[model samples]
Target chain A: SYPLEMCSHFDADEIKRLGKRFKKLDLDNSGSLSVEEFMSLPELQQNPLVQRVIDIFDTDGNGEVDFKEFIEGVSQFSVKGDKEQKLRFAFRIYDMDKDGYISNGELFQVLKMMVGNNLKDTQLQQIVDKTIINADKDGDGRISFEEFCAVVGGLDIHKKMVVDV
Target chain B: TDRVVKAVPFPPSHRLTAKEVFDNDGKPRVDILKAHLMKEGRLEESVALRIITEGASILRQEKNLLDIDAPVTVCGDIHGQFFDLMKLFEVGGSPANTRYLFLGDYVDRGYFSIECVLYLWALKILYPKTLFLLRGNHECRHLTEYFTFKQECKIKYSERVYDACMDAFDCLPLAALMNQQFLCVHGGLSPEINTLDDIRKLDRFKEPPAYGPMCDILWSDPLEDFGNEKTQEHFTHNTVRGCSYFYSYPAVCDFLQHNNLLSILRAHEAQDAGYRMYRKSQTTGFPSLITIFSAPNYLDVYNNKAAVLKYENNVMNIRQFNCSPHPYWLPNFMDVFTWSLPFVGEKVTEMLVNVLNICSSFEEAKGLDRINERMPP
Candidate 1:
């Protein structure tokens, strides 16, 4: 109903550059890009690209596309989409190790971001661990970005991410 | 009996704690219901109760009698602005010093609650002859539980003092009369009260935590004759039966006519000026309905002026006063540092709500209860 404008404020050149990065990472053309396909691209996972996203999202030592980690990690990607970018930025923080998978620890770092300045250290550690371990479907130490996003998006909508008073 | 009780303001040392006021038991008194709940188990609550009223016996004593022939000023809610009270002191003739009457609510909701209550208490100590203090709806435990008074004192004084304050609040008198013509109370005419004696008889009943005639007396709204309306704008509703906000001007006039009361003086609502006079009888343009809010610009939030009135020698006059600016509270990022991260987490939730409401969607909001581990199939 409103403007059909894209969220990112990228210039035409930057938009073309991001389109190239997306194309470079989505080599399989499978709609969702996997770590293998994502990291292999020169434009998407080059030293600076990886370093910036990794530094932004990778809160821990594991490298993976955790939902929160991915959102935050790539949120600044070309600055075209605010919501998607923020989610991407948030995801990267969760990815922690910068690997292609998200671990419980990685998920927790993202949860920590959501709580902001109010969460206590102990409380942060506790609920976050619960969130990751409890939500992890497989016995593996990590969760994929898709899995993390699915769980977080399904969380109680009533629980707001922030408040004023 | 124009017996002039020549008076000099007493020094501070002569000031009595709540304990001293209770010693003089013959004064007419009203007991707030919530005061009893505080006394139920915790000694701290009881002590806070006593401290709040300035004494224990202040409530238990026989309400001191007022002269029916002498002119007496009737006033309403003075929610604890000391300067306004001082102005009222001048206009109302130091009820303690010159036959003045205060209805109730000497604390809470005002920045200078401490100063207001203490000054009144000091007046009671110094000039018990002229001034009389009554209780209001706010002088209860349930209300104190939420307001700053309970938290402020516990932070400033001690739990013991807080408990004493709560206790003192309960024993405050319910209503007062002057010259059998004027009725002074904190709130308005209760649906249950049809006569002055009915008000006196109210003290006979034991107050409950909530819901009852006592509750109505404290919480009832006073309006005019609105016979069948569901809500009266100025009155309040509790568990009390057939009780609601007062009806309208017509209703109030009828009540006054029935009770032989010349006028009603109350102080529950805030006024920009110190007082408001709603003239009733068109025959004389009589100032039959009066509201005296001595606490000017109460709560340090409102920028209101204050006023009071005096009735003497067959005449009445209103006086006004100005007040100092209230204290300011600065945000502290440093204190934020010391708080636990969980508190920060809570703050985050709050901030998110604010952001979403301001910049995103206000709907789809969630509460802590909604938090749970779940994923869409």
Candidate 2:
């Protein structure tokens, strides 16, 4: 049999506390956490991208995320995770209206947070127009959720949007 | 004299020895050949010659215009990027799982020209029904001489192997008619043929002419009255290509209408976005004419994407993929003097900088400029 340590950066004491929190979130006796368990926290219940953020943790495509999948995802988000991936899942926040599509204004708003101050309006509009032209496959002048997912491939977003935990 | 071609045996210790690629029955093990080719390995001289001869024989029987089936993935101008060609197979499913029609420019530019052509020939030999290859403008002997494939063949093996490949290119088909709906070619339409029969009956079995119907089909390009979007003339002289005429948007529309075809699929030109659809119907944005370029990041400069056109049950889809990283080599073999020039200059530059900066007095600076006079030309 082989033995393993979770990560070299974190000593066993931190993992022990992290494991206890996982136990608290499990709510049920099952080794995996259901949406109800994590979503029961009201702050995340209103969060636009929390559901997708959790779904990303469930790498096996199962609705419930086991502790192993949970720890790996959290480590990348907090400790060892690269910012490139942290930027990826945040696209779910684009359609603030809770619709499955992002129009030009909403897309511009999302990118503006990343692009920040003093960008020329023409250049900004140019960015939005080109992005829409490339991804708006149905020629609807808006990116459907599928279209957003399609263009998101190989793009890095996590650098601007990672959280400490 | 006609049979002067001799075979060079494989280096037996290599992964795909001659025995493995071709069995005793003379049938090639295509899947094995595919893996070795994707990993950037070369075929033995004998194996390459055999594949070329068999491929030429098969292509000789096919018409200048072929009838391809639906559910086929159509690719454009591979241009010797064998690794990118493999990336294409990865993106569109392997050729084993799906059918393909490669729309020409099988050789040129990329260093892998030899591997790309021979591997394509092997695929054609094994799956003649599903895999279709069309002649590109670069497939001729003169074009190869102008570009990398001829020298690539000479470098990896010899000039004789290149001549054998040239013989096969002469036998390559010019265009494919897919399910009577789409016409695929390396280039575009020519006024020399108002009908498909004009292309079908051309008797294309030698080096293409510098001008005329056959050459125009291989050399012609598409022209759009971009801002005006109006084309009064059907055909105009192509200033860019010099050899062929530019078929206008209306011209393509007219040809498709008269030939009883839906669209023309071509690949001579690289599209920045991998593929572009001309005269997109306002209703659904489906293009009247589609161009697919299979070599991504074209010539390692354009930074262009590549795409494949897939049709199943009469519905068309375009799938785009980026180029894969390839092994890099210096252009042409380096001579000793040439290879050391950059480093030699840098070392001399560093010495001069240090000498100027560290001078304690004018006495130290006076002698340094004298040494600099010995600088190499």
Candidate 3:
């Protein structure tokens, strides 16, 4: 999987450190961390660690994340992880269907949820169209993971914390 | 419209007491004030100042967290939403009949902050035991300087009134204990705090600190984490709130267990559902925290519901309500501005900018629809 190569970028020391952190969070010794476990971390407790963050890490839809998934999930925060890791997280979040591609319905739902459902249909449609125009690398109607990665490659994932204002 | 008129003798023999100002129905003695202020929607400056001074004196005698044993209706942030406040009284029961503990943020954002605070202060003086008030983060001097409360005070009366109100805000209690079971505060628990006496021992006669127990009690929020497991850490500086820290459920569990309290009730954030209840620990069966915001359609933007918690016979009931309609006007401005005006003053323009910014945030919250067109002159 893509995350195996993603982990290779980090040194053995870093991986070991991450593994220690993961075990500490996996309180029940279940080998996988639940949403509640992930949120209990001191650094994450105060921040907006919403279901979206959980959904990205729980790749298999099992409602819990294994160490492999955990490493990949938190790698986006590490300096070792490149822009691809950040892009991959966003792609997973947008690809709600879990079909490995961003469908139009997924894009529409994301826009509505982010910008607010009160937006007019025409305005939301324009935004979705504009996003597709920018992200659809192969000129296909839908956005693939590569296309999503390319689009959000330069984005800062850490800065995505919601402003409490 | 027909206006109700009444007379008061010039230079009255003695200062008017709260009971004399409120009638048998628990309504303000409109006759004592400029009846038009209440009826026509403006409070007399003198009456407002008097009520504030009297209220402050009474509040100065109370502890940082009030200890009360009674059937109380606990309401959260009002934020100058006056009509909805009236609705709260109507729905929650009259002050004469019901015991109320108001979680603050009484003066800011909404058009009727002066009226809201003044009415509440008068009621506090009228029924000190029956009606209690706790200070919210917005009740501080540093916060009000940027928000509408300072501007509202300046426009309604003068900067002196704003200063006087801040003095009153300083005296306001930070928390309230209900029947030894429920802990009520404007924000949440402070990491530095261990017992109720810790809050009481706080010299709460000045502005809230940039960071500390005082600020945390009025600014902090529950840690928004994922799992049901207890973390090793208890609390951390809350970067989201800027001034307060996020406290863990373990921290909450410890506080509750140590205090022998069942739950902490607070208000600061607006929840779309009006109120949110949380378990003491992720795995604990007992719920220990609740946030209730009483500003419905908050800032005339969020379509969120408002709620009040009624505690009686060791049972707490949640009563939610919607917003009420009122003539929209800039804070402290008695009239609405029209775009057709050829020119506007710089001060008016500044006020309009503040108002627009407030509305703009709400627009961002729910997404733009009709709010998009609500540009200031």
Candidate 4:
């Protein structure tokens, strides 16, 4: 059978409930969900993080997410998620283009919002360049998931992302 | 009267077993065991215990500072990345060919501590002289119980196995001196230790202490001289690890000078490129100190390379390798049902919350926020 959850953290019985959650998300009688259907989630519509979350949760990149992708992607964030796995969840947010790697421009845009005139562009590009250079191990252009994990691993991002809150 | 219950053929059946790995004459079938472990098969508990017992006996007789010769490959930390160890064997030749002095940290961090430590134990038992194991900070019960090893132990085998493994760790040789030239340890120097004999004089048959020479031997790290900060003290309190001191380049050189050695070799930290050559001695043109970590992609997060120091013919060669893929199973101690509970709850709560809007539920109605008045905007 397919993996029950990410690393099989959720059992079959547990999965049956996740499918029920799917039924709630599946607004139309058509079983699977488009981005709109998933976005129909109460607060998810307002949250900026949800679109990319949907892109990843879409799994097979099929533009729509079936229950299989839905439950499996749901499984990814739950318990048994290691630091690497947790890092990927954070990576999803920063990788705005959904191209699987974070560009300097994308990272700069995200940082600009947080740092309002905190630093000039000339100074800020230096920071982004330095960060990009450090994270790109293979001398390739953008930061892959592996490189992202290494550079930001100590960032303690999980402290806020934890479900315990 | 008691019934004779014939021990119930312990382990019932397994792909790898002590009996299979050992011949009738009690010698290890190194090839078979190596092949089996690489294939992701666990040795029967009894056999693993037996291997542990025999390996401990060999280690018990060895000294804290095991004085040895050259023409050996000195490895750093391998925190239970067993498949990579197979890669390590391929890179540095098998135990049958290459004489190895593994620098502690045989468990923890990685997932397969049992397979990693046991495979090494299997080799140590078979090739006592050809291979030697050092006691790293994590080798003791304190670190194992705190990290992944103890948890893995109870799950894969039993607490009994953990106890047995810890017993072996208590007696693992603390340091290995190669050709009376290079000093190999899991950690760096102890400021308290004036001479090599000081290492020899320690009571090496128990849990490593939190302080003094033994602790320093297993817990200390060499501090690199940064551009500014005027270089760290020869022996400064290691605020990072929270235990042991950080021996600076001056202290390492001083220790080597007094002890009459070429360099100090250790493997407590991971380098992005696998190994670090910390300051070469002016006289020998050799690194005064070297740190090598054998587990690549440390903790599955570092994404760093790992290397082993191949010391043969008095020449030290660094061989680097990346992470090798290994078998995947459930996270430690959590079965599908146990961890799945949270998933199920999240689904149920979210599903309920999703439809709770339209339903005149007990919570919504009792709150007196009338849905009739609070119509959709």
Per lDDT, the best of the predicted structures is: 4
TM-score per prediction, in order, is 0.49, 0.59, 0.58, 0.65
Q: How accurate locally is residue B98 in candidate 4, as Cα lDDT from 0 to 100?
A: 80
- lDDT of each residue in B1-377, candidate 1, tens digit only: 11111121111211233443344553312222112211111123333344345444544564522333456665567664545555565665635336667777776655445546644554554445456777777677666565656664553346667666666666667777777777777667655667766766655223224544566555555443333445434344422223334435655676688887788777865677767777455544675667777766555545567666667777877767666532221122111112222333243233223222321111122121122101011
Q: Which residue window of length 10 is worst by lDDT in model 2 chain A?
A: A156-165
Q: What lDDT tens digits, residue by residue, belong to model 3 across residues B1-377?
A: 01011121111213345466656765566345433333423444565677789889999999988887768898998988877888898878988889999888897778678778877887787788889998988887876776677887775567888988999999999999889888999889887999998988989999988868898898887776712436757787775666677777778888888888877889987777778887645444557789998999886778889999888876778899999865344234421111111111222222222212332244466444332211111
lDDT of 2 by residue, B32-133 (tens): 887676554566777778888898899989988998878889998888898898888888887777899988888877888887888888888878888889
Better of 1 and 4 by DockQ: 1
Q: With candidate 2 superimposed using the best TM-score fit, by how many Å does residue B105's alpha carbon deviate from the native?
A: 0.6
Question: Candidate 4, residue B33: CA error in Å?
Answer: 1.7
TM-score of chain B of each: 0.65, 0.83, 0.81, 0.88
Cα misplacement distance, residue A98 of candidate 1 (Å): 39
Candidate 4 local lDDT, B1-377, one digit each (tens): 01112221111124566569899888888888777666555677888899999999999999888888778888888888888888998898877878888998888767788988888888888888888899888888877767778998986678999999989888898888888998899888888887988888889888877778888888887664521226646888876577788787778777889889998889987677788887778777888888898988766666778899888776688999998875444456343223222333343334334432322222333234232111112
Model 4 ranges with Cα > 4 A deviation: A1-165, B1-15, B226-232, B353-357, B361-377
**Interface RMSD measured for model 4:** 22.1
In candidate 3, the residue pairs with backbone N, CA or C atoms under 3 Å apart (3 or more residues apart, or in different chains) clash, namely A35-B226, A35-B227, A36-B226, A36-B227, A36-B228, A37-B227, A39-B226, B37-B42
Cα displacement (angstroms), candidate 3, residue A117, comes to 24
Candidate 4 lDDT score at position B364 = 35
For candidate 2, give the lDDT of residue B43.
66
- Can you give the lDDT of residue B330 in candidate 4? 41
**Model 4 C-alpha lDDT per residue in residues A48-105, reported as the tens digit of each score:** 4445566767767878877777766655555555666655766765676778887767
Candidate 4's displacement at residue B256, Å, is: 1.4
